[PDB]
Amino acid sequence: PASLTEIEHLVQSVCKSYRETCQLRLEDLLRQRSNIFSREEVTGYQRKSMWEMWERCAHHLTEAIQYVVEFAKRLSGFMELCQNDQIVLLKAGAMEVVLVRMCRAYNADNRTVFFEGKYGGMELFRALGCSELISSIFDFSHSLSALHFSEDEIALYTALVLINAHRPGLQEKRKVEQLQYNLELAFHHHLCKTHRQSILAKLPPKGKLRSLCSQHVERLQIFQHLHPIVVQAAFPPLYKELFSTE
Amino acid sequence: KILHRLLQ
Ligand SMILES: C[C@H]1[C@H](C)CC[C@]2(C(=O)O)CC[C@]3(C)C(=CC[C@@H]4[C@@]5(C)CCC(=O)C(C)(C)[C@@H]5CC[C@]43C)[C@H]12
């Protein structure tokens, strides 16, 4: 079970773990919004080769995933699960957490994302050759930005994205179920305390995050089929472990 | 594999 004192302690524990494992502080991302890529710089990105742009994005995604891994390890109860279920939860949830965290680096006023020191629109990634996926991710960040998430709200929501008792392959499903339920109580208690329960109906549907990750794996296999040696020789090992089954 | 080492 859990009393009111224990639920509130869980809230603060989750928010602290998130603060300690956020890649960049929100204030750092906000104070850079005027720093936008020039038209010549955007053109420079569009002329880079497809495989060089793919490995740069793979590198940035891998760095972000590593902070999500540390977030999970600080999450109360996660290290208490068996390592099989720890890996199952991270394999299916790490990318999903990064997609939610991305909205902190997204400026809804001009539809730009902070990328390699400056803000750029989705045309910055045109060399990737997956404009539908990029557009879907930018649209997802746009829908999240309309909610005006606080850092505490992102902390508790991404914990629930990670701790999902429905992931296929879990061996101790009931143990994850109790941890997910405690985090749901903490999330909803914090929304009730802060009069923010109206955002519950506006959160993205369940299949939305899994649809984006499926698109990502789908586009990766298209690129890997065109440049298999590039992936083997120049992609990060953690990236290939999560997304190309290695 | 990498995830195993990061969790240790
Ligand atoms: C999650 C955040 C973090 C909160 C702050 C740092 C961060 C960074 O990496 O610098 C900011 C930029 C982004 C949002 C981050 C991670 C990965 C994505 C991503 C590669 C993922 C999806 C894609 O395919 C595209 C659209 C190409 C994006 C471009 C923007 C970055 C790179 C990091």
Short mmCIF file of N, CA, C and O and ligand atoms in Angstrom, two decimals, chain A residues 23-24 29 56-58 60-61 63-64 95 98-99 101-105 113-116 125 128 130 133-134 137-138 216, ligand 1:
data_model
loop_
_atom_site.label_atom_id
_atom_site.label_comp_id
_atom_site.label_asym_id
_atom_site.label_seq_id
_atom_site.Cartn_x
_atom_site.Cartn_y
_atom_site.Cartn_z
N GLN A 23 19.54 16.13 -18.99
CA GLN A 23 20.76 16.39 -19.76
C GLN A 23 21.18 17.85 -19.65
O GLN A 23 22.33 18.15 -19.33
N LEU A 24 20.25 18.76 -19.92
CA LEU A 24 20.49 20.19 -19.79
C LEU A 24 19.39 20.79 -18.93
O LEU A 24 18.24 20.35 -18.97
N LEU A 29 18.23 25.89 -21.86
CA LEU A 29 17.57 25.78 -23.15
C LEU A 29 16.77 27.03 -23.48
O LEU A 29 16.69 27.44 -24.65
N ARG A 56 25.22 11.42 -36.80
CA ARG A 56 25.17 12.53 -35.86
C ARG A 56 23.91 12.47 -35.01
O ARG A 56 23.96 12.70 -33.79
N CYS A 57 22.76 12.16 -35.62
CA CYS A 57 21.53 12.04 -34.85
C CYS A 57 21.55 10.80 -33.97
O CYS A 57 21.02 10.82 -32.85
N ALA A 58 22.14 9.71 -34.46
CA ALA A 58 22.30 8.52 -33.62
C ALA A 58 23.16 8.83 -32.40
O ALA A 58 22.88 8.34 -31.30
N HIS A 60 23.56 11.83 -30.88
CA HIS A 60 22.82 12.67 -29.95
C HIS A 60 21.73 11.89 -29.24
O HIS A 60 21.49 12.09 -28.04
N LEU A 61 21.06 10.99 -29.95
CA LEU A 61 20.06 10.13 -29.31
C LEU A 61 20.71 9.23 -28.27
O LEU A 61 20.16 9.04 -27.18
N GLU A 63 23.48 9.72 -26.50
CA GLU A 63 23.81 10.51 -25.31
C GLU A 63 22.57 10.77 -24.46
O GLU A 63 22.63 10.70 -23.23
N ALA A 64 21.44 11.06 -25.11
CA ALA A 64 20.21 11.30 -24.37
C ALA A 64 19.71 10.03 -23.69
O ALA A 64 19.23 10.08 -22.55
N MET A 95 13.68 5.22 -25.48
CA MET A 95 13.39 6.12 -26.59
C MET A 95 12.13 6.93 -26.33
O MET A 95 12.06 8.12 -26.66
N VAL A 98 12.95 9.84 -24.13
CA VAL A 98 13.67 10.88 -24.85
C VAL A 98 12.71 11.73 -25.68
O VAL A 98 12.86 12.95 -25.76
N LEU A 99 11.71 11.09 -26.29
CA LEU A 99 10.74 11.83 -27.09
C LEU A 99 9.93 12.80 -26.23
O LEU A 99 9.57 13.88 -26.70
N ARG A 101 11.10 14.07 -23.22
CA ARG A 101 12.07 15.06 -22.77
C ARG A 101 12.39 16.08 -23.86
O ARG A 101 12.79 17.21 -23.55
N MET A 102 12.23 15.70 -25.13
CA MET A 102 12.58 16.58 -26.23
C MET A 102 11.78 17.88 -26.21
O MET A 102 12.26 18.92 -26.68
N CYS A 103 10.57 17.86 -25.65
CA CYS A 103 9.74 19.06 -25.65
C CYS A 103 10.34 20.20 -24.83
O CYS A 103 9.96 21.36 -25.02
N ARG A 104 11.29 19.90 -23.94
CA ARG A 104 12.00 20.97 -23.24
C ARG A 104 12.92 21.74 -24.18
O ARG A 104 13.14 22.94 -23.98
N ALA A 105 13.47 21.07 -25.19
CA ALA A 105 14.34 21.70 -26.16
C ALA A 105 13.59 22.22 -27.38
O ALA A 105 14.23 22.61 -28.36
N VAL A 113 13.93 23.28 -32.70
CA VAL A 113 14.48 22.45 -31.64
C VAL A 113 15.95 22.82 -31.46
O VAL A 113 16.64 23.16 -32.43
N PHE A 114 16.41 22.79 -30.21
CA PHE A 114 17.81 23.08 -29.92
C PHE A 114 18.67 21.90 -30.37
O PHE A 114 18.53 20.80 -29.84
N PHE A 115 19.54 22.13 -31.35
CA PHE A 115 20.32 21.05 -31.94
C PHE A 115 21.73 21.56 -32.22
O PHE A 115 21.91 22.45 -33.06
N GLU A 116 22.72 20.99 -31.53
CA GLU A 116 24.13 21.30 -31.74
C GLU A 116 24.39 22.80 -31.62
O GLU A 116 24.98 23.44 -32.49
N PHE A 125 16.90 18.77 -40.88
CA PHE A 125 17.15 17.33 -40.94
C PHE A 125 16.75 16.72 -42.27
O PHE A 125 16.56 15.51 -42.36
N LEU A 128 18.32 13.52 -43.85
CA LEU A 128 18.04 12.19 -43.31
C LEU A 128 17.18 11.37 -44.26
O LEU A 128 17.28 10.14 -44.27
N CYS A 130 13.87 11.10 -44.08
CA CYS A 130 12.73 10.55 -43.35
C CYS A 130 11.87 11.71 -42.84
O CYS A 130 11.63 11.88 -41.65
N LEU A 133 8.80 11.00 -40.54
CA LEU A 133 9.14 10.73 -39.14
C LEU A 133 9.50 12.02 -38.41
O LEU A 133 9.03 12.27 -37.30
N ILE A 134 10.36 12.85 -39.03
CA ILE A 134 10.75 14.11 -38.41
C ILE A 134 9.53 14.98 -38.16
O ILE A 134 9.39 15.60 -37.10
N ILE A 137 7.62 13.67 -35.17
CA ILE A 137 8.27 13.97 -33.90
C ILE A 137 8.09 15.44 -33.54
O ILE A 137 7.80 15.78 -32.38
N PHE A 138 8.25 16.33 -34.52
CA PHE A 138 8.02 17.75 -34.26
C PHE A 138 6.58 18.02 -33.86
O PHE A 138 6.31 18.84 -32.98
N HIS A 216 10.60 5.06 -35.99
CA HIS A 216 12.04 5.26 -35.90
C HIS A 216 12.80 3.99 -36.29
O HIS A 216 13.73 4.04 -37.10
C1 LIG C 1 16.33 15.22 -25.34
C2 LIG C 1 17.16 16.48 -25.56
C3 LIG C 1 17.66 17.04 -24.22
C4 LIG C 1 16.51 17.38 -23.26
C5 LIG C 1 18.52 18.28 -24.43
C6 LIG C 1 19.69 17.97 -25.33
C7 LIG C 1 19.26 17.43 -26.71
C8 LIG C 1 20.55 17.14 -27.49
O1 LIG C 1 20.77 16.06 -27.96
O2 LIG C 1 21.38 18.00 -27.61
C9 LIG C 1 18.50 18.50 -27.51
C10 LIG C 1 18.21 18.01 -28.93
C11 LIG C 1 17.42 16.68 -29.01
C12 LIG C 1 15.93 17.02 -28.73
C13 LIG C 1 17.88 15.69 -27.93
C14 LIG C 1 17.94 14.39 -28.18
C15 LIG C 1 17.60 13.72 -29.47
C16 LIG C 1 16.95 14.66 -30.50
C17 LIG C 1 16.72 13.97 -31.90
C18 LIG C 1 18.01 13.35 -32.49
C19 LIG C 1 15.73 12.81 -31.67
C20 LIG C 1 14.69 12.61 -32.78
C21 LIG C 1 15.15 13.06 -34.12
O3 LIG C 1 15.19 12.31 -35.07
C22 LIG C 1 15.57 14.52 -34.24
C23 LIG C 1 14.35 15.33 -34.72
C24 LIG C 1 16.65 14.62 -35.33
C25 LIG C 1 16.05 15.02 -32.83
C26 LIG C 1 16.87 16.31 -32.90
C27 LIG C 1 16.96 16.96 -31.52
C28 LIG C 1 17.63 16.06 -30.46
C29 LIG C 1 19.14 15.99 -30.80
C30 LIG C 1 18.33 16.21 -26.56
#
